[PDB]
């Protein structure tokens, strides 16, 4: 049910369309380089849709990873 914490509630004022801010977009990624779903981010439809393309831009720039490796399995 993802009752741990919401990324939006665990954050303050920030720009969703900013693709250069890495320390904020790192929080929206999972343990892997995948994009967190709606239940983890706690965003809306439009917010999630903008976040998707901004994360893709940050990945192409080389700031966010396309994929990572799971640890402690």
């Amino acid at each position: 049910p993802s009752r741990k914490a919401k990324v939006k509630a665990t954050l303050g004022e920030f720009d969703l369309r900013d693709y250069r801010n890495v320390e904020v977009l790192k929080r929206f990624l999972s343990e892997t380089g995948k994009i967190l779903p709606r239940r983890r981010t706690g965003l809306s439809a439009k917010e999630q849709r903008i976040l998707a393309k901004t994360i893709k831009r940050a990945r192409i720039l080389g700031l966010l990873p396309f994929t990572e490796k799971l640890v402690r399995k």
Partner: protein, 101 residues
């Protein structure tokens, strides 16, 4: 005449002279396509999330400019000829969309 943002990631192993020459070529190409610069933010070398050109780091440059649209792509090609320049991304400027306000 639209407003754009240019992100240029190049080799962080360049010395000051080679970096100065690369930035000189960048400014010269911007003048050759009529790109009026409004501001600039040079973040320096930063750690990449994945190796680009066999290098775990990259030197970043950002330019907010205003230029005619018809040659925007035609400018991007000119910035990809330099072997030191390894990433060029041009994005139309957009107003910030703030969340949790």
């Amino acid at each position: 005449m639209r407003r754009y943002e240019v992100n240029i990631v190049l080799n962080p192993n360049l010395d000051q002279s080679q970096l100065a020459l690369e930035k000189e070529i960048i400014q010269r190409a911007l003048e050759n396509y009529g790109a009026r610069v409004e501001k600039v933010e040079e973040l320096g070398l930063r750690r990449l999330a994945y190796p680009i050109a066999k290098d775990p780091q990259g030197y970043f440059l950002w330019y907010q400019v205003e230029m005619p649209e018809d040659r925007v792509n035609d400018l991007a090609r000119e910035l990809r000829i330099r072997d030191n320049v390894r990433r060029v991304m041009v994005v139309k400027s957009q107003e910030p969309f703030l969340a949790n306000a």
